[PDB]
Amino acid sequence: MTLSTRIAPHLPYLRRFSRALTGSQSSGDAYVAAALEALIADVGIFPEASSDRIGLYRLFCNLYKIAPLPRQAFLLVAVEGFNDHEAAEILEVDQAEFGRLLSTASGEISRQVATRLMIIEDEPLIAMDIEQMVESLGHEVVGIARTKDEALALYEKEKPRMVLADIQLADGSSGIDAVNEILHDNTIPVIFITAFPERLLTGERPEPTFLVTKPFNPDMVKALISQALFFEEASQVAAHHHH
Ligand SMILES: [Ca+2]
């Protein structure tokens, strides 16, 4: 198999990482597309790594030099599924320096501004596991919506600051379409939940910025909430800066 076919299976997850790192689907996808066009132009730039996946993420991180280095470290382990040694190789740091980078991250990521959030999830055990993780971080669950109709009603009554939404509901209907109705009147951070993340990581049409895989490591949820609030704060500061 050639480099194109060696790396092609790893592109969806690299977009997930890129979007979590930049805070938008447009910047996330564009940084992946740029690294991909750089590789096609000169195959020799591909780093020599332990695996094709590590080499792809290493090339991305070297081209990218965007959230800070401890946030990159935590994302690689908590969201991306790399062990500490693979992530240190991706970041081009010694295992010892990565451990300190991860501690600086763990402190930042574990300290989140208390937020009121709505959960759109029909599976009771999944709904409770998200609730328990969110509460452990100091957040407040305003309620759990199981359908699109309950979600719009819960959004109007409680006005949550953030939404954690499953892709498919009790009814065949889309959780994305349900969320898109809220996003019109008010722009709030949203973290999507799906059993099939690759379907939403093509970079070929409008897709989620933040994507949790179900079932999830609770650290994946913790990390993505932290990023969403990190960019929400930067966005709010910049939007009211001239006032
Ligand atoms: Ca203002």
TrEMBL record:
Where would you find this protein in the cell?
Cytoplasm
Keyword Phosphoprotein recorded = yes
User: Where is the Response regulatory domain positioned along the sequence?
Assistant: 116-229
What are the protein's UniProt keywords?
A: Phosphoprotein
Read off the SMART domains from this record.
Answer: REC
One family from Pfam that matches here is PhyR_sigma-like
Task: Classify the main location.
Answer: cytoplasm
GO CC annotations on file: cytoplasm; host cell perinuclear region of cytoplasm
4-aspartylphosphate modification sites are 166
What sections of the protein cross the membrane? none
Which Gene Ontology BP annotations are present? phosphorelay signal transduction system
- CDD domains the UniProt entry points to: REC_PhyR
Q: What protein name applies here?
A: Response regulator receiver
Could you name the domain of life of the organism this protein comes from?
Bacteria
Q: Which NCBIfam families match?
A: PRK09191.1
Check the record and name the InterPro entries matching this protein. Answer: Bact_response_regulator, CheY-like_superfamily, PhyR_sigma2, PhyR_sigma4, Sig_resp-reg_PhyR, Sig_transdc_resp-reg_receiver
